[PDB]
From a paper:
Ricin is an AB toxin consisting of an enzymatically active A subunit (Ricin Toxin A-chain, RTA) and a cell-binding B subunit (Ricin Toxin B-chain, RTB) linked by a disulfide bond. RTA is highly catalytically active in depurinating the adenine base at position 4324 (A4324) selectively in a specific region in the 28S rRNA to inhibit ribosomal protein biosynthesis, causing cell death. The active site of RTA consists of two pockets, the primary pocket catalyzing the depurination of A4324 and the secondary pocket accommodating the guanine residue adjacent to A4324, with Tyr80 dividing these pockets. Thus, in this study, we report the synthesis of 7PCAs with tripeptide pendants having elongated C-terminal residues, in which ornithine and lysine residues with an aromatic ring were employed as the C-terminal residues to direct the interaction with the secondary pocket.
Numbering used by the authors: 5 to 265
The structure:
Amino acid sequence: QYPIINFTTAGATVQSYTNFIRAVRGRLTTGADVRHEIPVLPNRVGLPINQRFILVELSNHAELSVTLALDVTNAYVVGYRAGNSAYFFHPDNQEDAEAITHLFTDVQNRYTFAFGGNYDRLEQLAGNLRENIELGNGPLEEAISALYYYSTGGTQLPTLARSFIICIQMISEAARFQYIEGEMRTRIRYNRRSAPDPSVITLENSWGRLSTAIQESNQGAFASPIQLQRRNGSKFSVYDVSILIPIIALMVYRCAPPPSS
């Protein structure tokens, strides 16, 4: 019932990845909510359960498949299915816990991890920060295998955490930020794996704040500037939504849009 988008690392190209991210964005947003040319994800408040999730079915050259479940309100990876087993991150609240009972309902083995799925927690378990975890088609290929073999004992917890970190950035972050999608396209074009630079990391860390600053802005003007980083780690100040239009593709819902004038 929930929409499924397919992607494979097997012979992936810039174009096939671009098609995939475009499809994900299309299933995440309805087109109802666009502010300063930037689409907003659906409001969690009053969102019917039959509209809450999308599924991303990842296949690889190894002929293995996993299905990630993404929450449409924030593009968050809430869990995954591999064959006979499904695994969910520890829910933040009771309504999220109920929500995930609507996912992978025919799976034989349902597990909820005792840990949450935020970067802080995942990096701790991985024993590596995002800045030291390589991204690209190769890492994603390997991540799909690692997720697939977890239930049978083939995948250690740090490798599982690492693999989540890869999937989240190459799917959810790429969906959120055209800039991050661009960085992943480059890695695919040249088949060259590399850890995310500070421009990628700071955008990921700032998604919530950027969403709020845009939505609370006075005609696009931020009350408080937001500091990002360039690829070389130097500071970049954001004062206005205008500079972000080519960078951010989707925002989390943070407030109601003010009336026009």
